[PDB]
């Protein structure tokens, strides 16, 4: 249904606002310039991860089909993939994604709207994929899988 010429032309014109190099490819410099003109300060690592997250080709560059997927995923209001991913980072300390079980037990016992001790204990028991007492972020994708 998107094959109609009007929406394709609209999206091509929108894509042209990022690619000032003519060729149908987006590099790091153009994205950095566009985000700089908006008042934000993108460092190399975060923007590299941002372009890699949509780049299924692996070439390190964004074409029109990748731009379509990126825009479709970003135009929606709530993205359950990232909203709780950032909530987990809120309690992170050194950005390693490594949270000890004691910290989780504390936060989900005093902070928030409270939780019964057996429920949080069961949740932490299910959280450790091995039992080392430290949880990674794959437990998040395990919840979000279904």
């Amino acid at each position: 249904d998107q094959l109609t010429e009007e929406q394709i032309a609209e999206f091509k014109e929108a894509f042209s606002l990022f690619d000032k190099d003519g060729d149908g490819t987006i590099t790091t410099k153009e994205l950095g310039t566009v985000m700089r003109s908006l008042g934000q300060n993108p460092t190399e690592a975060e923007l590299q991860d941002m372009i890699n997250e949509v780049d299924a080709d692996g070439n390190g560059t964004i074409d029109f089909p990748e731009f379509l997927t990126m825009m479709a995923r970003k135009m929606k209001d709530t993205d359950s993939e990232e909203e709780i991913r950032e909530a987990f980072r809120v309690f992170d300390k050194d950005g390693n994604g490594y949270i000890s079980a004691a910290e989780l037990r504390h936060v989900m016992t005093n902070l928030g709207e409270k939780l019964t001790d057996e429920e949080v204990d069961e949740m932490i028991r299910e959280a450790d994929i091995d039992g080392d007492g430290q949880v990674n972020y794959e437990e998040f994708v395990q919840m979000m899988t279904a």
Partner: protein, 361 residues
């Protein structure tokens, strides 16, 4: 891609098209109400068939309008379901969502039903304090609140704006996370065109309020004072600017409430009008530079003339004092006075030039 990004556009177009019929069917009812109110006063009484026809039309339009509103809200629910990733429509109901729908239905469900119903109305006259009593009709209570249906204009304007519906604009807004609500568009309009919106708002409110005041006041009025359209316009204009009332004070609390509303709105809007006026009486960068250049050019000549005037008087005094055989005292005094005058002029012009250079620095 996979019917995604096309389904959303289809829903957007359907929702945008559903918002024009509501405006048409609301404006139709408002116009028919105004015509019926004007005509039933003197042309025909309340028992003729013309009133029945002109009220049946209103009822039909109201029914269609309610149906269109319900369908619009259903499409809104569908759009939310697609947008937030939900799968059951019961997740959308969040109390205030129900409350706003009920409020819109109640606002749009008011109109004069056909029939012949009357009531009793009493008022106290202004400046004489004499009671009055009349047998009014119920339709005046039900006709005035139709002006609440004017909120659909804002909805149409928001849905038809280029900022709201543009792929590049939405992409930029997604990158720099913002909310595309009606307050954003209102602020944008205030930024780009701060005078046109105020002019249109004032000119519309003036006429609506004048007609409302006349319609309320025509019942207890036998001297053609507050039932005159031009008199009502004058009253609204002078109450907006907060000058006074003259000899034209309403005998009705409806007129008093309208006057209070216009007074509040004028007190709020006059400051903005006079603030935006001053933005037009100023110079840009280039004309500022040209102005400063010419001012310095003139000041240099003035300084030169003042210095020459200072130097001339000293020679004149010396000549008439030490180089003349007979001393005349009627000339030296004049020359000394002019010497002091030239000194003061030189000081003044030098100070002014220095001040202008310092401020332009």
């Amino acid at each position: 891609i996979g019917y995604k990004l096309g389904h959303r556009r289809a829903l957007f177009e359907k929702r945008k098209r559903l918002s024009d019929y509501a405006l048409i069917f609301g404006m139709f009812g408002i116009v028919v109400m105004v015509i019926e109110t004007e005509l039933s006063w003197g042309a025909y009484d309340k028992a003729s068939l013309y009133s029945l026809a002109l009220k049946c039309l209103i009822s039909l339009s109201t029914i269609i309008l309610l149906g269109l509103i319900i369908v619009y809200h259903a499409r809104e629910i569908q759009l939310f379901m697609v947008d937030n990733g939900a799968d059951d429509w019961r997740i959308a109901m969040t109390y205030e969502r129900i409350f706003f729908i009920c409020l819109e239905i109640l606002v749009c469900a008011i109109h004069p039903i056909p029939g012949n119903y009357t009531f009793t109305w009493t008022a106290r006259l202004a400046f004489s304090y004499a009671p009055s009593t009349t047998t009014a009709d119920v339709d005046i209570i039900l006709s005035i609140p139709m002006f609440l249906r004017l909120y659909l204009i804002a909805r149409v304007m928001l849905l038809h704006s280029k900022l709201f519906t543009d792929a590049s604009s939405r992409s930029i807004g997604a990158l720099n996370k913002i909310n595309f609500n009606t307050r954003f568009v209102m602020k944008t309009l205030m930024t780009i065109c701060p005078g046109t919106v105020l002019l249109v708002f004032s000119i519309s409110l003036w006429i609506i309020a004048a007609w409302t005041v006349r319609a309320c006041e025509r019942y207890h009025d036998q001297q053609d004072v507050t039932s005159n359209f031009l008199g009502a316009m004058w009253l609204i204009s002078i109450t907006f600017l907060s000058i006074g009332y003259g000899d034209m004070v309403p005998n009705t609390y409806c007129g008093k409430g309208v006057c209070l509303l216009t007074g509040i709105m004028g007190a709020g809007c006059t400051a903005l009008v006079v603030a935006v006026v001053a933005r037009k009486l100023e110079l840009t960068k280039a004309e500022k530079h040209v102005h400063n250049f010419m001012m310095d050019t003139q000041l240099t000549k003035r300084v030169k003339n003042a210095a020459a005037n200072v130097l001339r008087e000293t020679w004149l005094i010396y000549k008439n004092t030490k180089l003349v055989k007979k001393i005349d005292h009627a000339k030296v005094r004049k020359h000394q006075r002019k010497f002091l005058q030239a000194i003061h002029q030189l000081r003044s012009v030098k100070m002014e030039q220095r001040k202008l250079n310092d401020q332009a620095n």
